[PDB]
Amino acid sequence: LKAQTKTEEFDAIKIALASPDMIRSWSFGEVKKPETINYRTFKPERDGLFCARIFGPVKDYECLCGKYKRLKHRGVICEKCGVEVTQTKVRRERMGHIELASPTAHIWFLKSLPSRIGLLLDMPLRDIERVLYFESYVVIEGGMTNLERQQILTEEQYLDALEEFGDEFDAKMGAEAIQALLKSMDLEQECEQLREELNETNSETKRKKLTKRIKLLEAFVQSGNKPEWMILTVLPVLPPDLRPLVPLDGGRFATSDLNDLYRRVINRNNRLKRLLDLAAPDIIVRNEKRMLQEAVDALLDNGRRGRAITGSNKRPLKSLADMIKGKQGRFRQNLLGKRVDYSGRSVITVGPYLRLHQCGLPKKMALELFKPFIYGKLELRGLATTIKAAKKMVEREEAVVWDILDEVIREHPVLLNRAPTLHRLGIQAFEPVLIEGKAIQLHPLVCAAYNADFDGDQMAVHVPLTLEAQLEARALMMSTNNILSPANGEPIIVPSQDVVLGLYYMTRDCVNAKGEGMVLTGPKEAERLYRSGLASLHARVKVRITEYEKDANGELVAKTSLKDTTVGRAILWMIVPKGLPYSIVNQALGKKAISKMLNTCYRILGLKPTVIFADQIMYTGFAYAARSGASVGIDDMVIPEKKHEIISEAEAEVAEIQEQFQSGLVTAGERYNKVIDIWAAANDRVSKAMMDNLQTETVINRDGQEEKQVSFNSIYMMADSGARGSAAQIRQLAGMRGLMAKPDGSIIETPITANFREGLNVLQYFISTHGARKGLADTALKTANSGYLTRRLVDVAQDLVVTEDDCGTHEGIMMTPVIEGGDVKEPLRDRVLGRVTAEDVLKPGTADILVPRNTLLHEQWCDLLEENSVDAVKVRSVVSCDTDFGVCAHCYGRDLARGHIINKGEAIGVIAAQSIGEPGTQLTTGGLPRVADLFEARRPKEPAILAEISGIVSFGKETKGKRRLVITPVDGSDPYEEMIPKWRQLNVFEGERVERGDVISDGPEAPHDILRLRGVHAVTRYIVNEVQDVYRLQGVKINDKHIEVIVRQMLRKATIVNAGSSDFLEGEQVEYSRVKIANRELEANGKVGATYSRDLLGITKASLATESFISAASFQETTRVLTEAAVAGKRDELRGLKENVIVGRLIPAGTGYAYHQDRMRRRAAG
Amino acid sequence: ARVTVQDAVEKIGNRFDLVLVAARRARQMQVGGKDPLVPEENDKTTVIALREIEEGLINNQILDVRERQEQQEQEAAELQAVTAIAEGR
Amino acid sequence: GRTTDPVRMYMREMGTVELLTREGEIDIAKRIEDGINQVQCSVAEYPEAITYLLEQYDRVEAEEARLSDLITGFVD
Amino acid sequence: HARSTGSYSLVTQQPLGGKAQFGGQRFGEMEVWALEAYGAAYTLQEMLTVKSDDVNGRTKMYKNIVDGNHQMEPGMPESFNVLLKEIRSLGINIELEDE
Amino acid sequence: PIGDDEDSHLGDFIEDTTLELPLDSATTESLRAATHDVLAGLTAREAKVLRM
Amino acid sequence: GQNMRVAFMPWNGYNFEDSILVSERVVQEDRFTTIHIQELACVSRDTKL
Ligand SMILES: [Mg+2]
Ligand SMILES: [Zn+2]
Ligand SMILES: [Zn+2]
């Protein structure tokens, strides 16, 4: 078969240096003139930056001169002025060139930090630049006389040496010099010689640089790049429409800055050719060559020399490098964003009538958005003759079009998105419901996922177009299909505020109320008792209920009974579906309980019942909260009667200690601590006064004189239910508020005695103001820090995707309850839930396997483990996965919005990064910066040091700035000796044995140490436990999984120790390496297999290494990446997410995982 | 309307390949080559296809098989037409 | 030594050259006259340089050229 | 605001309001990530190819949309297409390999 | 640069007026079908003369 | 702006977050109505045509 020549669907991409002949291959003509357009007739001046002949026709299928105007003549080259008449679009495509007079350095390869021309020649940068500027002479191929090959000479020196040796010696200067150097260079010979020199001399200094350079050279040879190409003989010109002259209003013109630059280049070039033909003196033509160099540099990348300025405008002109780089840090237009058709946005409102699967979409918006569908559906049914008439109709908004819109809307989902998109739930698919209004209506239960208030936040709509997009939106991005946070299995659909105040008010009980003590047949006549005004919503009552238990085999058992409950609970029970026990609704129904109701319902009945359940819960919560008549008055906030007395006594203490400071019994600072302590104690007392009084003070009589229960006061119910408010804010309302602190952080010893229910005076308010402003500032800052962090995270993860099914390794980490210092800061059940078992586990007695090797532990399995006393389970993790270049689903876990095991092909790196990132706004060394420090693996300020090796140790030498520690292993050799500065107080016992990784001092320790001296499981455990300490201290739920995948990405690279295939000390992929030593253990060499050492790379560091260069050019410094890749002739195969996002094809994950896989196997095959 | 796709996800495991298969069948309906295997409620081809997945009468196996048959069904017709191209010799 | 900014590596490079004395200008100009006249005389000593001019004037009066494309005029 | 098919920017072909008929919404990096977490490839592809950046894709799309055929024949986004020239405008040769 | 100091620059707002709108492109595609059917209407010779 | 009779109480979740639920009495009385004044322009230019 003939493979192909012309257009196919391409794979990979290649980048390298460009030959002059190559640059010519692209060029369809040489632009010889600085002229742009004719100045009256605006036609392009022929062979100029804007040209019809070289580039293309000005208007569609029309010759410039005007002779051939017909769409027939096409491949015709006009005789008058040759222009092939073709679409004007080809003026957006065709390149050009300029043949420079003198050679020119390409500023990218001269000024890139590791100067390419420089280190290829082993020639220092400043020397090379000194040569290019004609500031000195440099030797080339010196032969055998007096002189080194790379040696530089001055005027007089060159003269003398020339007088001595006429021939068999050579020296040039300028660009031609460097080009001659590069051309003369033989890489292979240098290779041989350097291998030898590497071998002969033993010094670290010598062979380090030696090996680095030889590797560099041989890489450059293998590239296919010849050094000469770093010096430009020919300069390509960019297509005109990519740097347009296009006219504006007022007859004014506007053009790209590349025109000024290209113009300058052409000018000085032609003038140089002229100066050559005029036989000018050296001092002139040299100046001209230099100026040409500067012009070219300014064109390519401006700012590495002089930063030339555009005509009449101070602001420096944008060069091609600046064209590529973009702005806003690193953003390549697939990054910062891209404008998109079929979209819209507006202010959002509530819409409680909605089912959770839908959203209100404004009429006009739907019309405009679905306009093309409407056009097609209108003439398909034949209501409109032609598409034109269809437009006329929808523009007239004729009566018949609304029905057609209702047709095209029905099964067609739409995507809704909010401004701060963090986790994947930031975008959710809904079924559109036509609404009269300009506002978008969004289901209340979703408001938590978007973090969307109703205070004027806006949402954007996007219309999924292709069939695949509709089905993706419906089966993936659909609201009902994500009920659970991907971070943790807990429901994100949890009722928010009004609803929970409703369910809370519903099931609650007062002491005495209408219908107290009576009995009812069932929930029906309970509700009937309530709605008729006979019985009160909350009263202690026995009613018969019928509950169910699915506890049979897949089967629902029925049981009936007389339960002691209230009227409200009885009414509410009507909603609860099937197999749930009445136990769940018989409580007070707080936010937590009202959430666990949903959770249990989902882990029992399945998805659909849970969906409709949540819906009904919302409806009833709203309705009954509305009926309840909850409100807030000024008298709802109750101040303690004892407040003033507490204030007075605590105010007596301060005058006590003040008297002592006057008499000098106590020091000023000690005094300060004392007074601050008494005032703090005061605040605690007032708070714990107002809390008792607010909470229990309802004193009410049933048939006797008195009884007291939890208060029915509004603000209390609100704070208690979890609807809104909290003990702190309520404390600020009634009790006194806090003690403030100056910006310094020195806490003021005269606290705010007054509260918000009372007035604050001038000073108090002024002092509160700082707290406010710093609050807004800090929060608004932590948003940015969160974003930056997530960014680093997806950058370090991204392409990690579930790929294989099961690697099948027994490997994994030991999962224990966290058990910190007190009782159980987090159980075992949460840590092991949804995680696969590495191996079978035991009862206290054995040959009884409860959980059999690798099995997803769901709620039932975890409860079965809980029945038994088992404290310990070994669990497979993403960090331990044997699979290379990805994670097997069997290792990951089940976690998702769905309880089933993770699908094959879902991209986990991204969702992990997101899951870690989203809560980051809620985090307060400790803190979010501590989190960053952890993920960056930064060695702390005052780190500890761990024993290098086990065995008895002792102290040696003296006081040089380090008092040396000598370790003595039992069997093995002693010589390990570390230099410990003695000015730091030690721990380690001079007479005792210390295990490797023991405490030889105090303070935090760098995870590099934990990785080396303790090992991979130990280091991953340290990272996960510390970061989880940070999050969990703030009340943030994040599964260990995501952190573990980030960790896996951190340790991706490692350094080799032994040899037999590749180089000694190289940092490299443990995927590559392990797949190589697994392959080397058999066949090949019988075993030559090398030993490596696992390395720890920070997230920002590990992100640096990416196979794909297109990917790297996105988030890294673009200018460097492009060069560094171009010299190696690096070939990007795509294969990742970011790269395929940039190039604009299907993501090698998700739905596209079926595509890229089917193509991946076709590649490197028959 | 299909409020939840979970059942279809039960019928084919992947849930991505669900989107793919359902899309394929959906196009078998939308471009008019074929007709529904189950009553159309005014549900668009998008949802009809998913209903077809839930009923278990449509998946990758069935589709591949049917297409493979239709290939030979066209080969049957064009048999006498293309064998007449013996002028190639 | 070199600040770059090529205005400087020019300004300094030309600034080495010393200004001419009023007599030096005439010395140099005299040298110019010497050289040129040498090439002119060397042209006058070539037979084909003569014969060609002759043929060209035979072409001028034959209307195959113009008097402006051969001579700029003589002395006169 | 709402937009179906509006005007387009000249330098890079992208949706732009010229009539005060608004340019579409900006789909950013984070939104792309959100699309990446879900398994939706086609939604993303159409998002950054046919619905926006593809000069061929958008029209070939619109015609299918009115024809009652939901599909996409994506082609290559014009941003990357331009970037290729911008890279090639320098001394760098960037090519598309194989088949 | 225009306002906000942001990446909004003058050239970003220059709209291509030389592009034909898809709203019209569809009608250019439809007109062909219409005139084709209508040209199927006339006698085969009249059709040839009008198409010519 | 304008002062008005206001009641604090959840009403059928239509006030859900900060949301405001307003009687028809207000939109009828035309009190919260606003008058906008826009300046539109038409420019007669010179084109080479
Ligand atoms: Mg807000
Ligand atoms: Zn012409
Ligand atoms: Zn694995």
Curated annotation (Swiss-Prot), chain A:
Gene Ontology cellular component annotations, sorted alphabetically: DNA-directed RNA polymerase complex
Entry EC number(s): 2.7.7.6
Biological processes annotated in GO: DNA-templated transcription
Residues that hold Mg(2+) according to the record: 453, 455, 457
MF term (GO), any: DNA binding
Pfam families: RNA_pol_Rpb1_1, RNA_pol_Rpb1_2, RNA_pol_Rpb1_3, RNA_pol_Rpb1_4, RNA_pol_Rpb1_5
Ligand binding (Zn(2+) 1): 63, 65, 78, 81
Domain of life: Bacteria
Family, as annotated: Belongs to the RNA polymerase beta' chain family.
Protein name, as recorded: DNA-directed RNA polymerase subunit beta'
Organism, as annotated: Escherichia coli O139:H28 (strain E24377A / ETEC)
Swiss-Prot record, chain B:
EC numbers, comma separated: 2.7.7.6
Catalytic activity, as annotated: RNA(n) + a ribonucleoside 5'-triphosphate = RNA(n+1) + diphosphate
MF GO annotations: DNA binding; DNA-directed RNA polymerase activity
Any Gene Ontology biological process: DNA-templated transcription
GO CC term, one of those recorded: DNA-directed RNA polymerase complex
Transferase found in the keyword field: yes
Protein biosynthesis among keywords: no
Signal peptide: none
Domain of life: Bacteria
Keywords: DNA-directed RNA polymerase, Nucleotidyltransferase, Transcription, Transferase
Enzyme class: transferase
Disulfide bond positions: none
InterPro entries noted in UniProt: DNA-dir_RNA_pol_omega, Pol_omega/Rpo6/RPB6, RPB6/omega-like_sf
Membership in a protein family: Belongs to the RNA polymerase subunit omega family.
Function per UniProt: Promotes RNA polymerase assembly. Latches the N- and C-terminal regions of the beta' subunit thereby facilitating its interaction with the beta and alpha subunits.
Assembly and oligomerization: The RNAP catalytic core consists of 2 alpha, 1 beta, 1 beta' and 1 omega subunit. When a sigma factor is associated with the core the holoenzyme is formed, which can initiate transcription.
Protein name in the entry: DNA-directed RNA polymerase subunit omega
Species in which this protein is naturally found: Escherichia coli (strain ATCC 8739 / DSM 1576 / NBRC 3972 / NCIMB 8545 / WDCM 00012 / Crooks)
Gene name tied to this protein: rpoZ
Curated annotation (Swiss-Prot), chain C:
Subcellular location: Cytoplasm
Transmembrane intervals: none
Family: Belongs to the sigma-70 factor family. RpoD/SigA subfamily.
Subunit text: Interacts transiently with the RNA polymerase catalytic core formed by RpoA, RpoB, RpoC and RpoZ (2 alpha, 1 beta, 1 beta' and 1 omega subunit) to form the RNA polymerase holoenzyme that can initiate transcription. Identified in a complex containing RpoD, the RNA polymerase subunits RpoA, RpoB and RpoZ, CRP and DNA. Interacts with Rsd; this prevents interaction with the RNA polymerase catalytic core and with promoter DNA, and as a consequence, promotes transcription from promoters that require alternative sigma factors.
Domain notes per entry: Contains 4 domains, connected by flexible linkers. In the active conformation, the domains are in an extended conformation, each making extensive interactions with the RNA polymerase catalytic core. In the autoinhibited state, sigma-70 factor domain-1 packs closely together with sigma-70 factor domains-2 and -4, contrary to the extended conformation that is seen when the protein is part of the RNA polymerase holoenzyme.
Protein name according to UniProt: RNA polymerase sigma factor RpoD
Originating species: Escherichia coli (strain K12)
Swiss-Prot record, chain D:
Source organism of the structure: Escherichia coli O139:H28 (strain E24377A / ETEC)
Similarity comment: family membership: Belongs to the RNA polymerase beta chain family.
Subunit text: The RNAP catalytic core consists of 2 alpha, 1 beta, 1 beta' and 1 omega subunit. When a sigma factor is associated with the core the holoenzyme is formed, which can initiate transcription.
Lineage: superkingdom: Bacteria
Reported function: DNA-dependent RNA polymerase catalyzes the transcription of DNA into RNA using the four ribonucleoside triphosphates as substrates.
Protein name, per record: DNA-directed RNA polymerase subunit beta
